């Protein structure tokens with residue numbers, strides 16, 4: 293399909309969000325890939341990518357994304373448009389909120405990927421984040437632990453934005 297959505301999940305929350313994002317695009321447009329089962333070369337099959345990853349253990353990548361991270365230097369993302377989303381806990385991990393998507397975007401952009409889908413920091417309370425880019429997040433940030441009532445509307449807004457930014 294046109295968009296490849298590569299997610300990792302420890303406790304299932306990022307996966308659940310990935311299915312909502314898929315359905316908001318239309319199932320016809322997005323193929324889901326759990327990175328526990330992916331090879332880094334699977335990223336080659338798409339010109340439009342969505343990267344999903346929760347932050348774990350106070351600022352670490354989810355472990356399946358950690359595995360792939362180490363091979364991202366073997367892939368060329370030039371010519372691709374890449375968006376990012378994560379789930380995280382702004383209350384419990386205020387100093388590391390959504391660090392994982394920041395870490396992934398730094399790597400993939402240095403490997404040539406162009407980030408699309410920057411997201412306002414309005415409505416979140418946190419101390420620091422590697423996903424911060426001067427007053428915007430590098431992608432959609434969800435918090436199912438503290439703000440689950442806001443997820444659906446956040447996804448609808450973000451996906452509309454991505455359909456425009458991807459030029460669909």
Ligand SMILES: Cc1cc2nc3c(=O)[nH]c(=O)nc-3n(C[C@H](O)[C@H](O)[C@H](O)COP(=O)(O)O)c2cc1C
Nearest residue numbers: 302303304305306346349350351380381385389390
């Ligand atoms: C031990 C532990 C550590 C966590 N560390 C972070 C963190 O550093 N930053 C963050 O934003 N969220 C942190 N979280 C919150 C998780 O990212 C959040 O629960 C997320 O929805 C999990 O997604 P998953 O179910 O897809 O694995 C942590 C949660 C646990 C239980």
